[PDB]
Amino acid sequence: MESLTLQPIARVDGTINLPGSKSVSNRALLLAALAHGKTVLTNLLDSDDVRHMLNALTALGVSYTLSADRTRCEIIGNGGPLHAEGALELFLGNAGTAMRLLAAALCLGSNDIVLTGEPRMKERPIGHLVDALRLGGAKITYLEQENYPPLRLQGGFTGGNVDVDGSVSSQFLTALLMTAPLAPEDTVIRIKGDLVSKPYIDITLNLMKTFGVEIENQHYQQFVVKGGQSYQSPGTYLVEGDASSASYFLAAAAIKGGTVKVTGIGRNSMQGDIRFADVLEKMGATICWGDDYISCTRGELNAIDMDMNHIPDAAMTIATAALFAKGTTTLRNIYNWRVKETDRLFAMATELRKVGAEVEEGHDYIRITPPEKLNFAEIATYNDHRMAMCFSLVALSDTPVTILDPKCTAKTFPDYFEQLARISQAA
Template sequence: MVDSLTLQPVALVNGTVNLPGSKSVSNRALLLAAVAQGTTRLTNLLDSDDVRHMLNALQALGVSYQLSADRTECTVTGVAGPLQAAQPLELFLGNAGTAMRPLAAALCLGAGDVVLTGEPRMKERPIGHLVDALRQGGAQIDYLEQTDYPPVRLRGGFRGGDVTVDGSVSSQFLTALLMTAPLAQQDTHIHIKGELVSKPYIDITLHLMKTFGVDVSHDDYRVFHIAGGQTYRSPGDYLVEGDASSASYFLAAAAIKGGTVRVTGIGRNSVQGDTKFADVLEKMGAHITWADDYIECRRGVLKGIDMDMNHIPDAAMTIATAALFADGPTTIRNIYNWRVKETDRLAAMATELRKVGATVDEGEDYIHVVPPAKLQFAEIGTYNDHRMAMCFSLGGAVGYPGDHSRSEMHRENLPRLFRTAGEHQPIGVIPVKAPFGAFRLLIKPVIRESVAMGS
């Protein structure tokens, strides 16, 4: 792994970006294809750490699949029922929340003894609300190190019935229960405690379940009703949508230094809530055009905003860095779940924005950013978190210099982000000289003490 990567600041961002597949859709589709009846061919699959961990886990559980050389097409032969472990098994899932939470639920259906574990940060990411709900349905689950956190041992037992899950920390808990419930013996009724975060991600889950032949009813997202004893059925071919949260970086670059940028693979009919990021840019002053299969952004005079972004928490991070280029302060509200992601993103974002000169107020569930009169040179830490890396790389690419440390940041949602920028393909840029030279990415991990979030 190289020690540094240089991004030249640009005067103009112009072009078309063909988006890689969505991580959220990729891993949901893989798991449903694995438990479905029939063979499913997934195209535009994302090649990232989360997806690789899911694929490795499915293979260890006896699921057969064929993967193309570029890892973007996968043909999965479903097992037509719950996943089974023929012998005691330990699955290492890295820091992949989109694998850990759904597999934790799915493996409570079949027989076997399976341990799910991961990287140190995964052991700090709460899973207690999901475990509590699964236990209400009969699941046998043990914590192996710290209560409410991975690693966990799963020994089946989930039957369904009435369960309650806290929806205020992560929508992945509800997603895991929803995808598992149709294969349970009994009907399942999932009651939501607290405010449900990231509802658009639940809509992705419901859309995927319907694609695989299962309908779910709900009472305004407060109670979900799922019939038991069902079988998922393969749709045959399934095209994974482009990753809408990754589109945010290119759209924001256009809003700041466009030119015009078009992102393809998503559009007005996308199942991903993160496409609403374009609406936020429009409120800030960018010019947005929608079509069925693309979103286009042109530069505008950006102004600060004050918004609840609970519905687009991942893409909202890009707004926090775009706020550096807006006229006036920006406040992003109702984003507590930033704190239980790959790092405590609220604390990390506040720390790094201050380094470039912004005045920042970090609250328990909000961030208030006042842009500086002039951006400062800084060393930017990325906390082994791909979204921190990509958000601040946006700043480097569109015109402020700094040393940007990171660890494995290229392995997640947009693996070819920097290669694409370096090759000027498919998006074109015009380099300019910055006051302090190029924007340099130092490839070194930044470790910060993290606060464990309880249930």
């Protein structure tokens, strides 16, 4: 078991040029593959989740080239739905963005493809998306547990009236939205009840528009999509820096700055996680907004009690930043933390207690009361990049922290620790 030990960080200050957004990267790659023309993506993220999407596109016959640092990609669009037969197996690691998006997209036409991944992915739900795709005509078989990957896709999605449950993942709706335009018939997608992670739907619509397709959004309750459309290459497209990856560095300044500036995202970003900066401001930090940067400067840090359904990923960063805040912090309406890389409510509560906090693990919330002083712990990371990145913040105290399996950060941010070190100062 590999591990890394972080020594106490006296102060953080500096500038980080962010790695590309995983959310934007995977949507842009799939749309580029489906589109007509050559798309050149710049600032693309090089991480496991994007690599699995790239490998899937390669297996499906899509041609592309990558720059030396794998952040520039020139994709030759397929000019329509992707195809493969012979039950071609696509291994997608634990990349939900690739699993959910491809599960829908590959239902267009005829195909015979199997989507699978790492053991944890076979435990992450996909039944709501499968139910919706079937209502639209798709033939999908669960090869192991009902409602979970692996899936055998045999095509047939033609459109029509499709209901989709939006209470567990917004990715199911995203996948349907990206797929429906290329179906032969028009599709009316109706959301059954609640919709979680709503801001990611805006990312999806933004990318679709970039690639030439718009739909009718009726207050996020129903979406009307015209079929028979085609995606078109936007030419050169700049992938925004990752706002979720930015959270650690902005939080580090809120705790131990100094001023930390992240570049690649700014006030105009489409990512909902830029709203993480607003939470730091509510806790007492100072935030500055630019066209291509967001910066945070240390002020004070007070506990907050907030519904975090709009920023589920970056919200994990508040759970460890809470160790440094005055008072008890409560993060609410985050049930789906339980169905992601690991059950994050169980994992976060378990590891936070190890450094001294008193924690109430609610069914869909977490309440954190910090200790007077943190203690050393060897942190388990549950094959979850964010557990490693969130707990790295423990080193902004007087105690070192040991992080198990630090390479798990590669799911979205291979160079995380070197970037944290870049802004770590001894004086």
